[PDB]
Amino acid sequence: AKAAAIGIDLGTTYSCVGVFQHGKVEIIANDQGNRTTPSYVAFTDTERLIGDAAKNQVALNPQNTVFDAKRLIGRKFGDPVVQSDMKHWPFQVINDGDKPKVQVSYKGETKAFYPEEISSMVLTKMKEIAEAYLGYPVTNAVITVPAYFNDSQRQATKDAGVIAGLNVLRIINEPTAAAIAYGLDRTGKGERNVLIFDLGGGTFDVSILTIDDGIFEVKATAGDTHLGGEDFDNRLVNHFVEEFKRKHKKDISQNKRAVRRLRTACERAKRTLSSSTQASLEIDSLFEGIDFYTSITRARFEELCSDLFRSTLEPVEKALRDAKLDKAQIHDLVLVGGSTRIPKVQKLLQDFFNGRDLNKSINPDEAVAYGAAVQAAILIKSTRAAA
Numbered sequence: 001a002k003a004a005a006i007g008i009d010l011g012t013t014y015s016c017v018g019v020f021q022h023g024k025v026e027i028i029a030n031d032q033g034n035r036t037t038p039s040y041v042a043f044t045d046t047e048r049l050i051g052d053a054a055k056n057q058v059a060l061n062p063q064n065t066v067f068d069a070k071r072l073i074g075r076k077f078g079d080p081v082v083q084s085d086m087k088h089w090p091f092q093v094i095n096d097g098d099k100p101k102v103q104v105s106y107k108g109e110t111k112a113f114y115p116e117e118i119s120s121m122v123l124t125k126m127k128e129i130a131e132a133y134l135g136y137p138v139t140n141a142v143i144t145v146p147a148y149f150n151d152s153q154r155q156a157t158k159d160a161g162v163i164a165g166l167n168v169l170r171i172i173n174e175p176t177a178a179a180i181a182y183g184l185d186r187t188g189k190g191e192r193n194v195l196i197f198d199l200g201g202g203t204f205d206v207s208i209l210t211i212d213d214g215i216f217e218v219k220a221t222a223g224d225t226h227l228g229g230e231d232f233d234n235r236l237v238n239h240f241v242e243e244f245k246r247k248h249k250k251d252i253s254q255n256k257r258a259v260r261r262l263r264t265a266c267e268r269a270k271r272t273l274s275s276s277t278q279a280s281l282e283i284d285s286l287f288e289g290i291d292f293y294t295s296i297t298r299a300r301f302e303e304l305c306s307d308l309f310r311s312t313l314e315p316v317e318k319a320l321r322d323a324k325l326d327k328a329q330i331h332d333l334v335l336v337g338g339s340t341r342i343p344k345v346q347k348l349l350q351d352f353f354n355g356r357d358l359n360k361s362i363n364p365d366e367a368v369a370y371g372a373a374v375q376a377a378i379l380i381k382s383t384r385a386a387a
C-alpha cells in the first residue's frame with residue numbers, strides 16, 4: 001500500500017535513479033535503455049526535451065540546450081567560478097539580483113530559468129523513469145549532492161526537488177551515499193575510515209569519511225572541479241587531428257561536424273580500451289570525403305592522458321593530510337564515476353596505497369544512486385514498536 005521512495009544521483013553531466021525493494025536495489029533504465037540519463041534540457045519552439053533527447057540534438061541547438069546547471073546552483077553571478085565557466089558555455093547566463101539564470105528561446109519567447117528550475121526538469125525526468133518501472137506515481141526521494149556543497153547549494157537542490165513535485169526526504173552527500181551502497185555503515189561498533197575516489201565525466205572528487213555505529217563524519221574533501229572523462233576525450237581528439245594532418249595534409253579542426261564526429265568516435269574507442277589493449281576507429285568521409293580508418297593501443301591512450309591520470313593522486317595525498325590519517329589507516333578504498341573503469345587509473349591508486357585492493361564491486365556510475373535508494377527506503381519506514 002506504501003509507494004516505494006527513490007534515490008536520485010543528480011549529477012553534473014548524468015543522473016541516475018534507483019529503488020530498493022525486497023532487499024535489493026534496481027537501478028532503473030530509461031525508455032531508451034540507459035541506466036544513466038544526461039543532465040541536459042533543450043528548448044525549441046514546440047518542445048522541452050530532457051535527457052537523451054536533449055543531448056542528442058545539442059550539435060545544432062547549442063544556444064538553447066542547457067547542461068552543467070549543477071555548476072551554477074546556489075551560487076552568486078559575481079562568483080569568479082561562475083564568470084570563468086560562462087566563457088565555456090554556448091548558452092547565455094544572465095544576472096538577476098547577483099544570481100545566475102540561463103536564458104533561452106522557448107515556445108516563441110525569451111525565457112530565463114534559475115539553475116534550480118533547470119535541475120527540477122532533470123528531476124522530473126528521473127521521477128518519470130522510476131514511475132515507468134514502478135507503475136504508479138512516485139513522490140518521495142533522497143537526492144545527493146557533493147560533500148563540499150554549502151547550505152545555499154543544498155537548499156537550492158531541495159527547491160529543485162519541490163518544483164519537480166517531489167517530497168525531498170533528505171539531501172545526502174554523494175560519498176556518504178557510495179559508502180551506504182557498500183553497506184559500510186553496517187559494520188557495527190568501531191571507527192571505519194573510508195576514502196571515496198570519484199572520477200566522472202567532468203569532475204574529480206576525493207572524500208575521506210569516518211563511520212562509527214552508522215554515524216558519518218566528513219573528515220576531508222579535495223579534488224578538481226575541472227578534471228574528468230571529457231579531458232581524456234580532448235586528448236584523443238588532438239591526437240587524431242594531428243594524425244589526419246600527417247596522413248592527408250589537411251587540418252580538420254575548423255569543421256565542427258568533423259570534430260564532433262571524431263570526438264564521438266574517440267569517446268567510444270576510449271571505453272573499448274578499458275577492456276581491450278587496442279581499439280579501432282572507423283569514420284566514413286570525415287573531411288573532404290576522406291575516410292579515416294585507424295587504430296589506437298591502450299599504451300598510446302595511457303601516454304596521451306598520463307599527466308591527467310597521475311594528477312588524481314595529488315588530491316588523494318592532500319585529503320589524507322587534511323584528515324590527519326596515514327595510508328594504512330584507511331579501511332576501505334571505494335571507486336565511483338565512470339572514468340574509474342580505466343585500468344591505468346585503478347593501477348595508479350592501488351600502487352599509491354601499496355597494492356591495496358579497491359572496492360569496485362558496484363557499478364561506479366550507479367553507486368551513488370544505489371546508496372540514495374537504500375537511504376530512501378530506510379527513511380520512509382513507519383513501523384510502530386512491538387511491545
Ligand SMILES: Nc1ncnc2c1ncn2[C@@H]1O[C@H](CO)[C@@H](O)[C@H]1O
Binds near residue numbers: 202228229337341
Ligand atoms: N569503460 C569505460 N572506460 C572509460 N571511461 C568510461 C567508461 N565508461 C564510461 N566512461 C566515462 O565515464 C564518464 C561518465 O559517463 C564519461 O567521460 C565516459 O566516457
Ligand SMILES: [Mg+2]
Binds near residue numbers: 200
Ligand atoms: Mg557524479
